[PDB]
Amino acid sequence: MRSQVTLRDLFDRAVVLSHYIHNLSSEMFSEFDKRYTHGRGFITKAINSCHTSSLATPEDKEQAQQMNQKDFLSLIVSILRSWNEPLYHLVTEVRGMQEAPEAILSKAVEIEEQTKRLLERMELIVSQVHPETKENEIYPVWSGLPSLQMADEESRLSAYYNLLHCLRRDSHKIDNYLKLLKCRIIHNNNC
């Protein structure tokens, strides 16, 4: 929309949100981990199957810097829109039948709304800088639902472990990305 939005203003709050959302994801993940896998022998296993990994992303900074700006910003939107369904199901899954984690839920609800909040911001950024960008419509599919809703404690709990991990990973991606774009478009520029 509008309400006197400048590109400086858009980025100002895009970075405030992306930093917040990431820190909240580390909080959520570290809390789940502690609370949910600290007395058990569950397998850590690193950077597992993240649904956003199918999309072309820079896995570096010079790679990100070198990148076409138009594609970079659309990438950011695709990631953010791909976290809709899994974040809806997370909240519904904690919320539904499921018990205690009133504290993890409280946090899932915020991540869910703040992401959507970030996406509109990002959509405006794009319209302002690259209005020639066409309706995005490409976003990676998510298939973790079956694994979230398993009877087997180890399977289900790890499916949660991994989704929170991936989320903490990707919210960290977006943050580095937005810093990099803000520093360029708004701040100290090479001419």
Curated annotation (Swiss-Prot):
Its main location: secreted. Keywords: Disulfide bond, Glycoprotein, Hormone, Lactation, Phosphoprotein, Secreted, Signal. Transmembrane segments: none annotated. The modification Phosphoserine is found at S18, S26, S82, S127, S158. Disulfide bonds join C50-C166, C183-C191. The keyword Secreted applies. Glycans are attached at N23. It is found in: Secreted. One of its GO terms (molecular function) is prolactin receptor binding. The keyword Secreted applies. One of its GO terms (cellular component) is extracellular space. GO terms for biological process: cell surface receptor signaling pathway; female pregnancy; lactation; mammary gland development; negative regulation of angiogenesis; negative regulation of endothelial cell proliferation; positive regulation of canonical NF-kappaB signal transduction; positive regulation of lactation. Prolactin acts primarily on the mammary gland by promoting lactation. Belongs to the somatotropin/prolactin family. Interacts with PRLR. This is Prolactin. It comes from Homo sapiens.
